[PDB]
Amino acid sequence: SLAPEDGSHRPAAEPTPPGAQPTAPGSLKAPDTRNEKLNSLEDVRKGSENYALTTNQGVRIADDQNSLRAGSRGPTLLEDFILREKIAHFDHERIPERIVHARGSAAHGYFQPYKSLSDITKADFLSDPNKITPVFVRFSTVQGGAGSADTVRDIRGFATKFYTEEGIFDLVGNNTPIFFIQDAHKFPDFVHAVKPEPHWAIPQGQSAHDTFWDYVSLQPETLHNVMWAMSDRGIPRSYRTMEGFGIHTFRLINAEGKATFVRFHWKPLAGKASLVWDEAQKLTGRDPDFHRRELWEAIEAGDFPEYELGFQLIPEEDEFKFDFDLLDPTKLIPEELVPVQRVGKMVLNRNPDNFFAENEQAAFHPGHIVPGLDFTNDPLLQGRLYSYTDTQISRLGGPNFHEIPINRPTCPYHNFQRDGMHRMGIDTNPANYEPNSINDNWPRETPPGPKRGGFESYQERVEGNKVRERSPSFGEYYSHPRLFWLSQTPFEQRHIVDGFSFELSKVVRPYIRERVVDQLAHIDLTLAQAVAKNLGIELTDDQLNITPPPDVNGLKKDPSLSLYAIPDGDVKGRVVAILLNDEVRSADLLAILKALKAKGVHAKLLYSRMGEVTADDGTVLPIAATFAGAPSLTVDAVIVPCGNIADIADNGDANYYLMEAYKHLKPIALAGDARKFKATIKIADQGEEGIVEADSADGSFMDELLTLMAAHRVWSRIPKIDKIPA
Amino acid sequence: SLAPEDGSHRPAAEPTPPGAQPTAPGSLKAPDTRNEKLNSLEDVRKGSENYALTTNQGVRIADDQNSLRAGSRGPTLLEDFILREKIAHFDHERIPERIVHARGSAAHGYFQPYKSLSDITKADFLSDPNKITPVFVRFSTVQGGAGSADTVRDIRGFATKFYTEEGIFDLVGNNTPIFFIQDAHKFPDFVHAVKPEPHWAIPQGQSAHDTFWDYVSLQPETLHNVMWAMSDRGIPRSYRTMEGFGIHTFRLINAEGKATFVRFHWKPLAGKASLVWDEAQKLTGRDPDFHRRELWEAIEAGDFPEYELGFQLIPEEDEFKFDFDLLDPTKLIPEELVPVQRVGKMVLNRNPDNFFAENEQAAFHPGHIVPGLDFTNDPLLQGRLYSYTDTQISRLGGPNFHEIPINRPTCPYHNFQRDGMHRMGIDTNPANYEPNSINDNWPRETPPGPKRGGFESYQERVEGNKVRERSPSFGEYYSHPRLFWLSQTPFEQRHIVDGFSFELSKVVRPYIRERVVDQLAHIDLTLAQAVAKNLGIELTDDQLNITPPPDVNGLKKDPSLSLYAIPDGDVKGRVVAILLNDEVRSADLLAILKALKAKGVHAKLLYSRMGEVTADDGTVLPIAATFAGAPSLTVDAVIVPCGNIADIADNGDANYYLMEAYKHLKPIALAGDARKFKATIKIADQGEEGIVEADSADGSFMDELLTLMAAHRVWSRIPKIDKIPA
Numbered sequence A, B: 001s002l003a004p005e006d007g008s009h010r011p012a013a014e015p016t017p018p019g020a021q022p023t024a025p026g027s028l029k030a031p032d033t034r035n036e037k038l039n040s041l042e043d044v045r046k047g048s049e050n051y052a053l054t055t056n057q058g059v060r061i062a063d064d065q066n067s068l069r070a071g072s073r074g075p076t077l078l079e080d081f082i083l084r085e086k087i088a089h090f091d092h093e094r095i096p097e098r099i100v101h102a103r104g105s106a107a108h109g110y111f112q113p114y115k116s117l118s119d120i121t122k123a124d125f126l127s128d129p130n131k132i133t134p135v136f137v138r139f140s141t142v143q144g145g146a147g148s149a150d151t152v153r154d155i156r157g158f159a160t161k162f163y164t165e166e167g168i169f170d171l172v173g174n175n176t177p178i179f180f181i182q183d184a185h186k187f188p189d190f191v192h193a194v195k196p197e198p199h200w201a202i203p204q205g206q207s208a209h210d211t212f213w214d215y216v217s218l219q220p221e222t223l224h225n226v227m228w229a230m231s232d233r234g235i236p237r238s239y240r241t242m243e244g245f246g247i248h249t250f251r252l253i254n255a256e257g258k259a260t261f262v263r264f265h266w267k268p269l270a271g272k273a274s275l276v277w278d279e280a281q282k283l284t285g286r287d288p289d290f291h292r293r294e295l296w297e298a299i300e301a302g303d304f305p306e307y308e309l310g311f312q313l314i315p316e317e318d319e320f321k322f323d324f325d326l327l328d329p330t331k332l333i334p335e336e337l338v339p340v341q342r343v344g345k346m347v348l349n350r351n352p353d354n355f356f357a358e359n360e361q362a363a364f365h366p367g368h369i370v371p372g373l374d375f376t377n378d379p380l381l382q383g384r385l386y387s388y389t390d391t392q393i394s395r396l397g398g399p400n401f402h403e404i405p406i407n408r409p410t411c412p413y414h415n416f417q418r419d420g421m422h423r424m425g426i427d428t429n430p431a432n433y434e435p436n437s438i439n440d441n442w443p444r445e446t447p448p449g450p451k452r453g454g455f456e457s458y459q460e461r462v463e464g465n466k467v468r469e470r471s472p473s474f475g476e477y478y479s480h481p482r483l484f485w486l487s488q489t490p491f492e493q494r495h496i497v498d499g500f501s502f503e504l505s506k507v508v509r510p511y512i513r514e515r516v517v518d519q520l521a522h523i524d525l526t527l528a529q530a531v532a533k534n535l536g537i538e539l540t541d542d543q544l545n546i547t548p549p550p551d552v553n554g555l556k557k558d559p560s561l562s563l564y565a566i567p568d569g570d571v572k573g574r575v576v577a578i579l580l581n582d583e584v585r586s587a588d589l590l591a592i593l594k595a596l597k598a599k600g601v602h603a604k605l606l607y608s609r610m611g612e613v614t615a616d617d618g619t620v621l622p623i624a625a626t627f628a629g630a631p632s633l634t635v636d637a638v639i640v641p642c643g644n645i646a647d648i649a650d651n652g653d654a655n656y657y658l659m660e661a662y663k664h665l666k667p668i669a670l671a672g673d674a675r676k677f678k679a680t681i682k683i684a685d686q687g688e689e690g691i692v693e694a695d696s697a698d699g700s701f702m703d704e705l706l707t708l709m710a711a712h713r714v715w716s717r718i719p720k721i722d723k724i725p726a
């Protein structure tokens, strides 16, 4: 026995707040959390306690510390079959990462609709409010490798596998409502442009390099999703606090055969929230696993990620009623024109057991639809349908990837396909072809119908010649970027200007910067001028005279495009740092922890060393991390309770911790003699909105802090932060 | 006509300093730098200019912007074989990364010995000072993925493929002289323990987590290489400023058949230099590609990485004359006991053309030796011999990986091996077996001999029973950790204590931290007390009374084990940030820039925006980056010239630039009114060692700065920095 006698090696199998217990595989942390898919994986879960160590052939091993050798200082012998199996398996551990979205984090959960949608769709998972569909969801960045950092500036993926009773449906979306390009033929060009450059394989996780901006300057259709990327949408706080979108128009098909166009939305019930760029960039260094960690720890705490599925629905007869093409995936459908109808709720409530087996090997593909859905001719969706099956057979080693446990349907699947590498299913059917008489033609085709029917495509009319040509209706590139720009708050605009300015400053060939600023002048002259000033570029008179693009169907703005213009804050699952001293005022700590607990906000107790400190009343406080070990970047607000403030008053790291949190617009709360830290961040005696201060930490102090936290950041401080050296 | 008319898109094909021109493929940047391997790759180099765009079957493409569809808003057709080939290739771009050392950066170069070594080895590449051997070198970290960050705390790999006239020799070493474990059977255990933990796949690029320190606390053989990783050896400034080691004792065999034991070394001719931890961790966020970038741009500037190969040589009769076993890879051979004899010089002077083709697909394996070398029974080396071929056939898709152009020998290769995936060579031999008469038995075996002979193993005597048993001679774990600790300067010892303290602070189970501190108490009580103090742990009286381990062969230190105890600084290829203002004193800038140029030190001119500023006298100064764009993390020293200081005096980024550089112990030089920045970093009016200050940048100001730069960092400043909020 190498475990400690006290049992402290094993985390409690109950919900616990971040940092309170070591994290664990999902089935051991939350063994009572079940759904049909989770249960179905029991055939392949493998335990360990009380079992002997063996080879993969079942032979017990006596000595797992040594190779077999001729004498104990002799050569290793070829007959050591136990060493060679162990080292061969290790030698073959890695598989290819995904070509894009290689970096991602996943969890299990469940979905149910609010009401039956049978009037618009015959899909079975949308038919009954009390029929629950398991899901597995992977969130991702796009450009970086599987070992890249989480809080980069990038688009994020949001892929949901729904294990329905009529097949797997994969809704493979991103966190912005449009993509960069119009036709899948260009996907390798765009991805190669954004990815590390091919001579030296730099930069990882960043679009701030010449080839990406070269492509953008030469392909104005990219500008819309570039605007989203350069805004704070490119730097979410958490995968719990971003939107999701399917991007393409799809179809819903009901039992009477009617097609309705649909775009898919996920609304985060925790609200929309993003980092600021200096925080995000520094956090890729202090904790490159911040989003993976925060997601796993939110589910271990019971702060399950919840999202509302929503549909924008457009009747068939209204296909051409907008000033943009519904099938153009560089155009969004403004919610002021077509509202999102609430459809159902998805809750992620258990982490996987083994990241490689369940997350790395999962395969999501947007051609996996079910009866009641269909595609459209969007030319980027069309080409996606070829790529996901093709790449998943390369990455997962052959055509039986649907038999890898995470990807298996929970509903029946039977057909005449056979063989392939690592075939697990042993078919007993005498026939491997149809039509057959020798098995009375089973398994059999099923006619389409209202429920449980075979799939039939909606009989869309196709009229045209065989052409490689872009629809002229797709040839407008600046109106949607402008609508997005005008819908942002002033601080969000400033952050967009700063994102383009920072990125193009890293473009070494100056003419590319100039060409991008010329594109920006076709969107908005105020944006283009503000970027140009930061680049040392002066717009020409012709640039100053470019006519702005038209409004989008009369809209001058749509506030649903902003992260912050409409309040939607939720503090449950956020975290505060509490900076301890060696004689903390216990009464402050009581009041602080009670008010945080009432709102579901977690706390991390920090100090200048690890171990414990004792409060004024004898209470022994364990320290979660040092001020340098868990920087302000990792929390949403900072509280300094009273005590022996002289202990930490001259500590550089405690002072910096407040300066960094202040620069990054976080609420700060100072009780009693902790108000002496007002001098590090230059707060006048009268106080400042976003700094909470009082003689002690009481009801009123904590309510004011929590109100600031519900607004996420203190935007009004922005003019005060350029002078702080942090 | 998408290129600019001024031709500024294309970098000059001449050596240029970092940042001055976009980087490019080696054969375009330095077409006239040649060696036999680089010439032999011409058969597969593919150009582009003036050629038509084609499918891989040579069919010209007319429209690479669109898929083929029935109507320009219609569905994509299956007959579009141009789209399908392009998206199929994209879908299968990735291959598995290396199981370990997945993150690496490589270059081409050449090796020449200083004199013939025919007395001690018949290896042909060491036989003649005029014999030049091409090399390809890959430097790497160990734990993180290919998309992880460069300036992590980790061991570094240093692998050299020598393309000799008698076969490929791969010298596959690391940047510390020992490894963590003694027997290859344990390598999957140790690697699994340091790699991201299996439930959640965190943390990337870090050993600061519970499973690593759990394994270390239960396997004290790891403590010697852990000491090296916790020292600043774990965070090199550049691959140019670290040492290399083969680790194992190997053999040299001369023409008379005499075996000499050898351990291999590489000495960096640029000196040894490392970062400090807060700088390295931050730099993983601000530039995760910093080491890859620095190596590439050193080569493009002519600052070619140079290393001296050196041998520690032990006669066969002296195998048992040390307190440690020569075959134990957790033990070093102190240079005070066995000096390194200089053997030759390697210069890396050309970057690859295509990172994937040449770096990602390169395969190095320490079983690739040539006649004149041999192995020993080191039980870690013996198990490596199985792993490398096994893993490379999985990673590179089959057993013909030696036909991938970068891995091909430059000498002849002919045998009776056939077929396999991806077979390039078309064999015309009538026979595919020997002995044969049908091809007169060619190709033929060759007897061993002094030159151009066949390989024969040295006939070492083996005697013992078949056992899975560790040699008792390997059962000593604390003397070499202690020798290392006692050989470090006081500031190096502080940084070791801070490394263990930071890492064990991130171990969530406190009993593991206690167990590690108990192991430190077996190495050195001062080390163990200082780490325990930072963890809030008190040593027991039993721990206070553990007797230290013995000295190693009478040594109580060996200064060659320190980075800094013996000055070896070289400033060429280093870089200085120059913080501009909008009216710089041009005389200061003339003096600063030409002084740096004379010593081969590069400069980056920084400001608060991109573009230009104008000096007092009209000189137009182009700006390389903003203060936030190119943080002090990325430079070795900071110079602030006189001029209009009020322009930048209240710029929080300019101030913080100097605070970060000051905290990280970098030299800082302030001319004229730039001395007003003394107050930002709290420098006495009377000044302090490490801050250069004068009325102007003339006289001795640049010599004083350059002297500071040759000592790397200002260690005496360490007690001054805990107080600084930065």
Ligand code: HEM
Residues within 6 Å of the ligand: A097, A098, A099, A100, A101, A104, A138, A139, A140, A156, A157, A158, A159, A172, A173, A174, A178, A179, A183, A184, A187, A246, A247, A248, A329, A362, A363, A364, A380, A383, A384, A387, A388, A391, A392, A395, B087, B091
């Ligand atoms: C609306 C535009 C797109 C969206 C929203 C989208 C979204 C995503 C997401 C979220 C993933 C990762 C799924 C996971 O977590 O495993 C992914 C993977 C992938 N995507 Fe797409 N993507 C789009 C366009 C395309 C296009 C145009 C192509 C190629 C024609 C493509 C090819 C791929 C490939 C090859 C993978 C890797 C899939 C795997 O290995 O399993 N994507 N995409």
Ligand code: HEM
Residues within 6 Å of the ligand: A087, A091, B097, B098, B099, B100, B101, B104, B138, B139, B140, B156, B157, B158, B159, B172, B173, B174, B178, B179, B183, B184, B187, B246, B247, B248, B329, B362, B363, B364, B380, B383, B384, B387, B388, B391, B392, B395
């Ligand atoms: C002295 C101890 C060792 C040193 C110095 C060492 C050094 C290295 C280096 C430098 C690389 C990267 C080569 C490159 O740049 O591609 C590498 C890769 C590798 N090492 Fe070792 N290694 C050690 C021990 C081991 C052991 C004990 C095993 C297994 C028994 C092992 C298995 C591997 C594997 C599987 C790879 C990836 C090779 C590839 O995919 O091409 N290593 N090692």
